[PDB]
Nucleic acid binder design. Structure first.
Lengths: 49, 84, 50, 99, 145, 89, 36, 156
RNA sequence: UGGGAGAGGUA
């Protein structure tokens, strides 16, 4: 009945709310899923502001 | 290019393919630059007076016989008189 | 230990055989034993049945 | 006791796959903390962040993101989404029909 | 009753000098048999970590201890385990707890036949040691004076 | 100096692959050992980089697979002790 | 034990830290000499 | 009453029967597999209690069934003394907890009150002595009149 | 004792 927690250094993305189509992150940010996957795979930078 | 790749070690081998191998002579120059940076950081921390008083008082702490002779000196009856 | 060796010559032993895990027949199974084959390891001393 | 550690009859242990996946996530997270404290190069710390993302995504759903992380006996491990979802999942094997 | 403080340390020091004497194996084997069957369970090449007394005073201490403790072997075995070999009291009490038969207990078991605990085992080996020193002491003054 | 000898790390960790750990974990811990070899390298002994870096990379990879490869973790001194007793007896 | 509804939602990091009882910081599960 | 070696023999057999009965109750504490590994590598200083060979257990159970079935209170005191392992003072204090005020006519002018711990210890001791005295002779006769099954024999 | 794979069989 007792859970623990791991304190992740870099905050990672949930795979359910990213890969279960429709992706909900591409549907919220209005970005293509391939471009979001390129950002998450550390292949290409994205600009915030 | 940055296609549909999913193996992270393949992307690691792509991101490490941008650099080049080292020749016979170049790593001696890189190690000389490393030692030049170490010599620069040592020669800039040399002339700070409170750091000099810190090393003398740590020598008073090791000469008061409660700390070991290994956690503050590595090398170069001799260190005692030169610190005196 | 050798301290316990000299004190064993003084006093003796104990039981130290509390937990019993003997092989029993599963329930419903019956019938006569027809063969008992006792393999051992090279180094362990055998018994009278072996 | 929901990711239990059950033994065998010959002294060797047979753990769940969740302990293996949790060990992977904890090891790569501890290595990311060590690489952020050691002032690592950009390529090395970026690969470690990518490894932690891959390990977390594998623990949440093994067969989803990319190549499924296989165990020691060349079979893909059972994640949390594989414990709940499927023909041998928690719902259709223990919640609806119980022993 | 028991002894006083100065007599306790005097008898303790003389018994460990005597224990360091017998631990080398210089006691003649025809003189007594209980120390002869005690000293057979130890190696001949023992080390000497304690100060050793001389010959005839240790002979006097050995003859007085097997003249007063010739009726029982258990308490004498505790005495040679504590002083001759040099084992501590806690190890002797732990091995006596791990060996001894179930006994009748009063005021804690209600008469239940059970094994003795470690606390009462330490207490009874302390009582055995104190009773053996009280049997040693005045006969030792009769041998000295 | 670090991002010019990563091929040495993949060359060392190519042989430790099926030892209970993933291939990418091996080269990551080899990179940690490569940084520890870069920080404590002396050039005045005539050797280039590789004869000093190989020992640290092999040490980091071996200390990675000796700890983070099993659930029931055996320390490295106990496993070489039982291996020495297994090879003599 | 007598509940009317089973509400599902997303989990904030404060709620996950409220569920937990201690940060797990080591991969090794149990020992090998004694199994504590 | 009885002598002391008879009491020692009867108390040993009844303690074995009590530990045999206590090894069959429903509610017991649960220990996981990690607790079993800790107990198998480094066990406790004190071990468990010895049990019967289940035939002596069944026979002593039938004997106390034949004797102590008419008295529920004395049989419950006997079970809580020999199986649960509680001392006589604990049973007397638990009897003092659920004690009902009874009309006494021995001290004073017959006042009503709750009985104290001294009379509770006395009645527990009297019940235990009378129970052991009633159990002993028929248990001796039942151990006497039991056929000793020997080892198996070889006919050719 | 409990877990996971692979093969075979019955309705």
């Amino acid at each position: 009945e007792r859970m623990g927690h791991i304190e992740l250094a870099s905050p990672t993305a949930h795979i359910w709310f990213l890969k279960s189509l429709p992706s909900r992150i591409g549907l919220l940010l209005d970005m293509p899923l391939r471009d979001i996957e390129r950002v998450l795979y550390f292949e290409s930078y994205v600009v915030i502001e | 290019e940055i296609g549909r790749t999913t193996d992270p070690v393949r992307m690691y081998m792509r991101e490490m393919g941008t650099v080049e191998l080292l020749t016979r002579e170049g790593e001696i120059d890189i190690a000389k630059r490393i030692e030049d940076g170490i010599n620069q950081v040592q020669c800039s921390v040399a002339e700070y007076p409170e750091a000099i008083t810190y090393l003398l008082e740590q020598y008073d702490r090791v000469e008061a016989e409660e700390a070991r002779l290994s956690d503050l000196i590595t090398g170069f009856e001799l260190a005692r008189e030169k610190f005196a | 230990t050798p301290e316990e060796k000299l004190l064993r010559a003084i006093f003796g032993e104990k039981a130290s055989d509390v937990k019993d895990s003997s092989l029993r027949v599963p329930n419903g199974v019956s019938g006569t034993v027809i063969d008992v084959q006792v393999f051992t390891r090279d180094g362990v001393e055998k018994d009278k049945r072996a | 006791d929901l990711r239990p550690l059950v033994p065998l009859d010959g002294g060797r242990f047979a753990t769940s796959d969740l302990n293996d996946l949790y060990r992977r996530v904890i090891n790569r997270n501890n290595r990311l903390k060590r690489l952020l404290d050691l002032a690592a190069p950009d390529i090395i710390v970026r690969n470690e962040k990518r490894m932690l993302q891959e390990a977390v995504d594998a623990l949440l759903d093994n067969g989803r993101r990319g190549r499924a992380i296989t165990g020691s006996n060349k079979r893909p491990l059972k994640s949390l989404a594989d414990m709940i979802k499927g023909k041998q999942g928690r719902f259709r094997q223990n919640l609806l029909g119980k022993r | 009753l028991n002894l006083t403080k100065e007599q306790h340390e005097w008898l303790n020091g003389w018994l460990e000098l005597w224990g360091a004497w017998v631990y080398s194996g210089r006691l003649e084997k025809r003189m007594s048999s209980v120390i002869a069957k005690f000293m057979e369970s130890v190696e001949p090449g023992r080390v000497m970590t304690r100060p050793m007394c001389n010959d005839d005073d240790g002979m006097l201490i050995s003859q007085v201890v097997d003249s007063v403790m010739y009726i029982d072997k258990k308490a004498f075995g505790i005495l040679l385990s504590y002083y001759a070999h040099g084992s501590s009291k806690h190890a002797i009490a732990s091995y006596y707890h791990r060996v001894a038969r179930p006994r009748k207990m009063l005021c804690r078991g209600g008469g239940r036949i059970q094994k003795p605990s470690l606390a009462t085992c330490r207490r009874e080996v302390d009582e055995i040691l104190n009773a053996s020193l009280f049997m040693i002491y005045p006969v030792l003054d009769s041998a000295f004076k | 100096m670090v991002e010019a000898n990563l091929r040495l790390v993949i060359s060392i960790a190519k042989k430790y692959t099926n030892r209970g750990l993933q291939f990418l974990d091996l080269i990551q811990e080899g990179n940690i050992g490569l940084m520890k070899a870069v920080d404590k390298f002396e050039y005045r002994r005539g050797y280039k980089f590789s004869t000093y870096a190989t020992w640290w990379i092999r040490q980091a990879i071996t200390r990675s697979i000796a700890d983070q490869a099993r659930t029931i973790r055996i320390p490295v001194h106990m496993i070489e002790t039982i291996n020495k007793l297994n090879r003599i007896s | 034990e007598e509940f009317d509804a089973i509400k599902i939602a997303l989990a904030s990091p404060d709620m996950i830290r409220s569920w937990s009882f201690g940060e797990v910081k080591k991969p090794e599960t149990i020992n090998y000499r004694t199994f504590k």
